């Protein structure tokens with residue numbers, strides 16, 4: 001089990017200049033012939049030539065067309081091919097090999113594998129070595145000349161990177177295609193696709209150079225009608241990169257391909273992007289609303305990788321955030337501009353502060369640039385991606401749009417043909433920073449700590465107002481808790497976007513201001529402040545931090561009603577909810593601990609409830625924003641604020657708070673649900689495949705949120721609305737009708753009805769499975785068994801497995817059953833999945849991430865299941881490393 005250390009980076013003693021591949025696909029095997037045109041680098045010290053090569057069946061290997069002999073001249077251990085130094089040439093040489101691989105039984109979905117009737121590769125991070133021998137690391141840049149051959153009938157469409165330069169018939173019903181890709185690329189960006197693929201296509205003309213680019217979107221025949229939105233999103237992505245960044249696509253064709261079996265969302269293979277079908281395919285009849293935003297983001301993300309990942313690549317895998325953080329940030333800017341709704345920003349923050357904050361306070365805590373790994377596939381994390389994105393977004397906040405665009409352009413121009421590190425990006429931003437500050441002594445050396453320091457900073461505030469002086473002071477403190485990565489934490493460069501609200505009229509008292517906190521603490525003073533303001537802090541969520549605003553509930557209610565910034569309003573609401581949750585939780589817990597026969601609970605603040613009503617009745621307020629305010633914070637956000645969290649107590653706490661609010665607002669909720677129907681469910685453009693209205697979709701989100709609240713509340717005659725909702729043409733509506741019926745005797749009636757609606761579309765079925773899995777059912781364990789026996793069976797499709805099990809793990813009451821049966825269920829699935837797909841087994845561990853934050857009993861139950869999993873004889877390297885890290889061993 002080799003540990004790879006960031007500090008150990010060294011260039012290779014070898015060069016690979018040219019790759020010539022012949023991939024011959026047959027019924028029971030795939031034959032891969034490869035010639036590597038190689039050289040000795042300046043860094044060479046006479047070492048053995050070692051190729052990565054995992055699970056390859058060697059037919060023959062040669063050096064300069066001379067066949068090598070096993071044992072005497074080389075050894076192979078199924079992982080590494082070692083050719084002894086004395087047999088390696090001292091100048092330019094050819095290494096050739098012929099290996100057998102077996103895509104049909106490749107269930108790990110890495111390297112070359114079969115997805116239904118499509119042969120497809122996945123090479124990032126370490127999958128190319130599963131196809132053929134290579135020095136499988138991103139700094140080994142080479143040209144690629146690739147020929148794919150297969151049965152014409154089964155595999156009429158053949159795709160790889162670069163220009164298709166030849167097509168030819170082969171005897172015995174076969175055919176071939178040659179693809180030459182002269183520009184240098186790393187091997188993780190190699191891809192091949194073979195299948196009976198149908199397509200839509202368009203032509204895009206670039207903004208400045210007026211180049212014609214052919215756009216092709218591919219899928220299985222059955223689902224080709226679902227490709228239209230993806231095509232629109234691709235065009236949008238190209239336009240945005242041209243409009244915001246002045247960046248044009250450089251190649252003559254871009255292919256997007258949907259496959260049914262995929263470990264993640266998608267993959268940015270150069271000119272040949274490959275997608276989880278759930279992230280490319282959609283129709284209004286057969287997709288939930290969420291699919292539309294998801295496709296926009298995933299197509300966007302993959303397109304933006306062309307510059308940030310593909311043209312400027314990574315020196316090494318420790319630089320992963322350089323492409324992932326930066327590309328997520330580019331996708332975020334894009335989606336905000338396309339959706340024109342505040343919920344795009346709000347949703348990313350909602351994800352970061354629940355999922356990523358949990359990761360950063362867990363034993364798995366790491367910086368966005370890790371210092372080490374065993375399995376690189378374990379580091380494609382919410383921290384590297386989503387905290388990386390916030391670190392990338394902070395540059396823009398600090399610089400402003402103009403100077404940010406200037407620094408980004410410096411980065412692209414300086415690094416376009418080559419590999420890069422995180423320091424290269426910081427360097428480019430510093431050039432922009434020197435220009436903005438108007439002095440070349442200014443630097444961003446301190447900013448580099450965002451790359452190296454793990455843990456979430458806590459930012460706290462104290463205030464002072466002098467009425468006589470018209471002087472307002474904001475004292476700010478920053479603190480990161482010690483963890484296993486750094487004993488001593490250092491102050492970070494924290495941008496704090498601030499406004500000051502006049503509480504008398506709700507108006508801005510100052511111009512836009514970003515406070516630059518660069519020390520452990522600082523005091524920021526403002527003159528000519530005419531009245532005591534309410535501070536609007538971290539506008540836009542301006543730094544990835546715990547915000548401790550120290551405001552009263554009165555001050556927070558005023559910001560919630562009157563502030564201009566959507567995040568501060570959402571956060572004020574969040575903070576009001578958290579104070580209430582912590583109070584009522586401690587009250588419930590004391591009553592439990594002290595075995596009380598009677599006790600008191602503190603009611604929900606009545607003026608807060610009045611503020612929610614005000615906001616909901618406001619015609620101008622965003623429907624998506626409205627759905628957040630009626631929803632309590634995520635369980636995974638809350639757990640960061642409670643030691644030894646008793647999940648039953650938290651469940652009782654949420655239940656009380658929801659009941660308190662609904663007791664006052666249920667009539668308002670029902671009135672809104674009915675009044676929103678017309679615009680939310682409008683069918684005017686249902687048969688327009690390209691017409692996508694994010695406001696309307698947020699209106700449905702609100703209606704369905706309200707319906708959920710009313711069904712839990714058992715509002716009079718609400719089952720009538722549920723039954724009518726099940727007759728909606730929109731899957732977001734009729735699948736919601738399934739989940740909300742959980743509280744009524746008609747649940748299995750709607751189970752059968754919605755299954756029949758879902759069963760003939762692969763992706764829709766997986767959405768039905770998620771809805772069943774997340775259903776608030778007392779018999780949920782019996783239902784999951786029904787799902788296993790009747791639908792899931794022995795599927796190895798990650799979409800199916802994840803859909804059956806993951807949503808269930810958010811069932812606070814039932815997943816965390818005190819018997820440990822929920823934990824045993826998921827561990828069994830993890831262990832079973834690990835035998836064929838280590839990556840997905842690793843994904844299925846997500847529920848265990850908070851194990852040491854729970855009450856004593858549940859802590860012991862989870863740890864027991866994790867120790868049981870670690871004891872498994874055949875455990876993967878991926879799963880073993882992940883669980884060892886998570887359990888602090």
Ligand SMILES: N[C@H](CCc1ccccc1)P(=O)(O)C[C@@H](Cc1ccccc1)C(=O)O
Nearest residue numbers: 124125263264265266267268297298301377
């Ligand atoms: N090149 C990346 C991951 C590829 C990979 C696959 C298997 C093992 C290791 C690495 P991606 O395009 O950033 C994948 C994104 C796709 C994505 C992008 C934007 C929003 C959601 C999903 C993801 O799922 O995390």
Ligand SMILES: [Mg+2]
Nearest residue numbers: 055056101102
């Ligand atoms: Mg094999």
Ligand SMILES: [Mg+2]
Nearest residue numbers: 207239242243
């Ligand atoms: Mg344009």
Ligand SMILES: [Mg+2]
Nearest residue numbers: 297344347348
């Ligand atoms: Mg998003």
Ligand SMILES: [Mg+2]
Nearest residue numbers: 260762797800
């Ligand atoms: Mg299937």
Ligand SMILES: [Zn+2]
Nearest residue numbers: 301305324327
């Ligand atoms: Zn990416």
